[PDB]
C-alpha cells in the first residue's frame, strides 16, 4: 500500500439559514456527514506515517485559504504594490467541524497507536471513509478547539535536537481561555485559570524532560511580526492580538489576565501582504475557547548550560492542520 495524492471532498453539517461564513462555505463546498461512519481495523498490518510530509495538510491549507478569501473581505489589501479596494461589511465568523473524506478509488489510513509520535511505523492501522470533525481554527502560539491526547501529553517534532524545527504539543486536559472586549473600543483581554495552566506546564515539562534532563524554562516570544509575538486569533469577525507573557514565564527544576488589542491592520497568513478591515463593532465581543495544544520553539545555543528554554511559536498555519491530521494518510487502491 502506497501513499497517493488526490482531491479529498469535505463533509460538514452547515445550516441553510445561517449567514455565518463557515456554514455558508460548507453549504456548497461540502456534503452532509455520515451518521454511522465505518471504521475497519487492519489485522497484522504495519504502515509508514509522516505528519511532516502529508499532502492532506497541503489541501486543507488551500481550502481554508479559499474559505477566508471569500468570507473575510478587507476594505483594502496590499499585495506587492497593487492596492485592491472593496466593500468590507462585518461578518459572523465561527468555525464548524470539517471532515475530509477519500473519493472513490482511494482510502484514508488511521494510526491508532496512542503512543505515536508523528513519524515512523504504526502497528495499529485502520481504514476510515472520513477523518474526524476538524475546526479550521486560525491562530498562533495557542492551538484552540482541537483534539486531545488520550493518556499523557505528546511532544511532536521532526527532531527536537534541531532548534529550527517547530514543536507541536498536544494536551490531555483542555485549558479554558475566555476573551472579552467589554461593552477604548480596541481594548480587550483574555482570562485563564492559573492553577489549570501551571498544572498544564507541569505535564509539558515531564514530557520535555524525557528529551532534556535539564531545568526547563518557559519564556515569551523574542521577536517577529505581531501575529507571531502574540496569541493571535479571530472572534466576532474581529482580529485579536493577545500578550502571552503571563503564560510563558516560569522555571521548573488563581486567575491569569492577558491584555489584548483588536487591530484593523493585519498581516495576512494566506500570503505575503497587509490587509485593512473596518473599525471594531460596538457592544460586547466574546469568545470562550479551549487550549488543546501549543506551538513551541526551543532556544539554540552551543553551550552546555544547565537549562533548556522554550518559547511560543507558529505562524505557519499548516502546523495547525498538522496537529489534527497527524494520524492520517491517503492511499491508492488497486
Amino acid at each position: 500500500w502506497k501513499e497517493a495524492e488526490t482531491t479529498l471532498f469535505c463533509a460538514s453539517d452547515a445550516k441553510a439559514y445561517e449567514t455565518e461564513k463557515h456554514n455558508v462555505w460548507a453549504t456548497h463546498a461540502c456534503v452532509p456527514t455520515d451518521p454511522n461512519p465505518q471504521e475497519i481495523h487492519l489485522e497484522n498490518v504495519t504502515e509508514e506515517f509522516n505528519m511532516w510530509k502529508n499532502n492532506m495538510v497541503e489541501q486543507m491549507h488551500t481550502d481554508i485559504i479559499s474559505l477566508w478569501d471569500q468570507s473575510l473581505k478587507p476594505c483594502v489589501k496590499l499585495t506587492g504594490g497593487s492596492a485592491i479596494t472593496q466593500a468590507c461589511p462585518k461578518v459572523t465568523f465561527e468555525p464548524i467541524p470539517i471532515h475530509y473524506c477519500a473519493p472513490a478509488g482511494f482510502a484514508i489510513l488511521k494510526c491508532k497507536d496512542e503512543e505515536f509520535n508523528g513519524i515512523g511505523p504504526c502497528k495499529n492501522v485502520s481504514t476510515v471513509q472520513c477523518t474526524h470533525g476538524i475546526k479550521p481554527v486560525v491562530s498562533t502560539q495557542l492551538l484552540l478547539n482541537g483534539s486531545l491526547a488520550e493518556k499523557e501529553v505528546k511532544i511532536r517534532c521532526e527532531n527536537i535536537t534541531n532548534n529550527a524545527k517547530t514543536i507541536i504539543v498536544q494536551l490531555v486536559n483542555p485549558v479554558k481561555i475566555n476573551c472579552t472586549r467589554p461593552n477604548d473600543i480596541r481594548q480587550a483581554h483574555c482570562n485563564v485559570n492559573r492553577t489549570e495552566w501551571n498544572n498544564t506546564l507541569h505535564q509539558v515539562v515531564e514530557q520535555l524532560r524525557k528529551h532534556f534532563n535539564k531545568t526547563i524554562n518557559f519564556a515569551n516570544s523574542t521577536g517577529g511580526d505581531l501575529e507571531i509575538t502574540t496569541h493571535s486569533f479571530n472572534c466576532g469577525g474581529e482580529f485579536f492580538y493577545c500578550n502571552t507573557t503571563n503564560l510563558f514565564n516560569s522555571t521548573w527544576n488563581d486567575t491569569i489576565i492577558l491584555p489584548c488589542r483588536i487591530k484593523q491592520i493585519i498581516n495576512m497568513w494566506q500570503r505575503v501582504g497587509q490587509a485593512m478591515y473596518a473599525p471594531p463593532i460596538r457592544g460586547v465581543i466574546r469568545c470562550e475557547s479551549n487550549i488543546t495544544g501549543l506551538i513551541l520553539t526551543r532556544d539554540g545555543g552551543n553551550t552546555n548550560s544547565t537549562r533548556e528554554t522554550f518559547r511560543p511559536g507558529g505562524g505557519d498555519m499548516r502546523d495547525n492542520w498538522r496537529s489534527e491530521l497527524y494520524k492520517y494518510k491517503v492511499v491508492k487502491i488497486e
Partner: antibody
Amino acid sequence: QHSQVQSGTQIKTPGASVTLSCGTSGYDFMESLINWVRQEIGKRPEWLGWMNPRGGGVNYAQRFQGKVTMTRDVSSGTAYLTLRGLTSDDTAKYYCVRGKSCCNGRRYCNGADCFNWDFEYWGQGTLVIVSP
Amino acid sequence: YIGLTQSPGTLSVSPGERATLSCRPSQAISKSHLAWYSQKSGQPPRLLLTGTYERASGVPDRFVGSGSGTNYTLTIASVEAEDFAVYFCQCFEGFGQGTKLEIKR
C-alpha cells in the same frame, strides 16, 4: 545564483549599538531561513541565531539573548542584525549565511521545512570594531 | 548539547602526503547531521561535505568523509597546496574548535 552582500566595516564606541545588513538575491527571499554567525579572530565560527523572513520569527543563541536583534525588509529582500550595548568582546567578524534549498517552487514551501544547517551560502562578512 | 571536539589541533603534512582529520561529537549523532568546512584567511568558511561523506561543489574526491556515532573523520588522499587551511566540523548550530592544516618543514 545566490548573492549575500553584506555592509561595510563599522567602528563603534563602547555602549553604542550597530545595525548590520545583508542584501540577498538569486532566490525567493521567503523560502530560506537567514542565520548569523560570529567569528572572533583566530577562533571558531559561533552561531548567533536564525530568522524566518516569513513572519520574522527568530531563535537567538542562549548567551546572545539580549545582545542581538534580527529583522528583515521583505520588499528589498534584506536581512538585518542589530547589536546593542557593544563591548570590546563584541569585536568580531559577522557573517550572514543560509543553508541549501529544499523548495524551488513547491506551493507552500517555507524555511522551516528545509534543513537549515548545511551552510552553503556565506556573505563576505562584516567586521565590527569596538573601541573608545 | 552536542559539543564537537576536533583533533589534532594542528596537523602538519607535506604536499602529496596523507592527512587524517578527526571530529568527536559529545554524544551519538546521525551520519546525516555532520558537515565539514574549510576556511582560508580573509574568506568565509566553505562547505566541503554536507552529509558525512556527501561532497559538494568543486570539492575533489581526494576529500573523503567517514564515520558514525561518535567518531567522524575527514581524510585528504593527497594534500595539495590549495588544501592548507583551517577545517571545522559541524553539527546543527555547533562548530568544532578547528584543525589547522599546516605545511610541514
